[model samples]
Target: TEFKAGSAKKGATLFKTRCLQCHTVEKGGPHKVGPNLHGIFGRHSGQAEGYSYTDANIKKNVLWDENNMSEYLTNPKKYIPGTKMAFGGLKKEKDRNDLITYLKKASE
Candidate 1:
């Protein structure tokens, strides 16, 4: 499904409420419960420094792009079976779009 362009402004808010507890987007950001998402776009999955990742994620060898991320954000486990991400996922498409937008911008 194609979604309209998302707002980075709104995305920031959504990210804080939903993703901040687990992830970070800034360079040198700390790894909390999850790996820091800095420069996650185009990055190979499960390769973040100092963060341990599931064998499933590491072996997947997937790249994190907008389309792939959209699907993954919809359902992490479904996208990568046996992955460690614990969030249920963003049920709304717009929320996922916006979050992706925020991540792209923040990770830059």
Candidate 2:
């Protein structure tokens, strides 16, 4: 199944302002307030090594990809219900699309 595409170039800009403070998409990037998001598309929830995840996250056991990520980005606390993440989520639909596009490109 194919996911919709957005402009990775625009997405990079969105990422810089919105996600960089707490996250990084580079492979093996250090975990900040949040775990490194590199290779997140195929990852399972709370699977990053060396990062401590709340049981709420580890037990959720979600597969990371466009569908799940879009929902998670809309509202983190609402989606997961018990995460420790306090950074509010990306709300605008276009913004989320752009950010995810950049993430997909940068993850590789």
Candidate 3:
């Protein structure tokens, strides 16, 4: 299902509060535990710098699209077996969709 900008905004807020500490979205935000998410949508997994990534993510050849993001957000460990991201995953489809929307909008 498609998500609206408003929904994305809400998700953005949630991300800022909950996910931004480890993840980065601004053009040059620092990479703490995870990589910066400026243009992650189309980027290959495990390609981020400084934050040594998992072999699973590299092997997955992850291209962050809607479907991939949805699945990854649902279960990060399952998505990439050795990923360092400890997030339990966002179980709600609405949250996933909205977060995707937010990411897309933020990238642009």
Candidate 4:
């Protein structure tokens, strides 16, 4: 499914409120409870530097792209069963798209 275009500015707001606690989008930033998301787009899951990941995530061998991220952000556990991510989900499609937009901007 194609997502509606989203705003990175709005997505930054959503990131702070919803994802900052566990993730970092800064380049070379340290990992929090979860991995640093500096270059998450187009990267393999569970391959972030210096972060420990669940076997399920590593074994899934999925690439992180906008489409995959949209689905994963909706329900991490459902997308990658046994994933270490504890956040339930972003339920809102706009929110997910905005977050994906932010991630795309941040990673580049």
Candidate 5:
């Protein structure tokens, strides 16, 4: 299902507060721990230029849709055990939903 707009807005704020330190969603934002997330939705799992993704992520072929994003948000390690995303998890379901919406919007 598509994301709700209200959830997206809240997710934008939440992302800025919690995720911006290591991730970027806008063009020209610094690449800290991860690559820019501007066009992540529908993007390939490990296709960022010049960024070396984990072997597991590169091999996994998981597209960045709502279901995948939600699962990843809930548990990074569980999603990709050998991947390098060190974030423990975003525990709130609402936050995950909001973040999924926020990412979809930013990607567009």
Candidate 6:
């Protein structure tokens, strides 16, 4: 709520273009290159049940939320070095905002 007004609809499109290759937002969805994102909020990195993770993810294990997600979306590897996630990072602040909002609800 403190970050910005993020439309979940726009976020859904962004997820398809940017994140669908590796991740899934639906409940009980199988893991792709990355893990399923159901109930991803308030979750720690590397904690997804069926997903294999790099040591870096388990080590940092930061809680996912607005501020942390904001930083991580800007640069995934930089935020957590040695992570196996292969994302170039979202360049726009608004894009991250939308995705965050979209995921918050969609993953529910």
C-alpha lDDT of all candidate models, in order? 0.83, 0.80, 0.77, 0.83, 0.76, 0.81
User: Clash pairs of candidate 5?
Assistant: none
- Kindly list the per-residue Cα lDDT of model 6 for residues 1-102, writing each as its tens digit: 356756878889888888877988887787878888788787898788768688898889888886778788889988898886789787687888888888
Best by lDDT: 4
lDDT of 4 by residue, 1-108 (tens): 797656878889888788878888987787778888887887888888688699999999888888888888899889999898899678787888888898888774
Better of 2 and 4 by TM-score: 4
Badly placed stretches (over 4 Å) of model 6 are none
TM-score of 5: 0.85
Q: Which candidate, 4 or 5, would have the higher TM-score against the true structure?
A: 4
- Residue pairs in candidate 4 whose N, alpha carbon or C atoms collide under 3 angstroms: none
CA RMSD of each candidate after superposition: 1.4, 2.1, 2.2, 1.2, 2.2, 1.7
Clashing pairs in 6: none
TM-score of 3: 0.86
Q: Cα deviation of 22 in candidate 3 (Å)?
A: 0.8
Cα-based TM-score, every candidate? 0.91, 0.88, 0.86, 0.92, 0.85, 0.90
Give the CA lDDT, 0 to 100, for residue 41 in model 6: 80
Model 3 clashing residue pairs (backbone): none
Model 2, span 30-103: residue lDDT tens? 87878888887897889888887889989999888876787788788888889866766877777787777788
Q: Sort by lDDT, best first: what order?
A: 4, 1, 6, 2, 3, 5
Provide the global lDDT of candidate 4 against the true structure. 0.83
Cα lDDT over the full model 6: 0.81
Tell me how far the alpha carbon of residue 9 in candidate 2 is from the true structure, in angstroms, after superposition.
1.8
Name the candidate, 2 or 6, with the larger TM-score value: 6
User: Of the candidates shown, which would achieve the greatest TM-score relative to the real structure?
Assistant: 4
> How many clashes does the backbone of model 1 have?
0
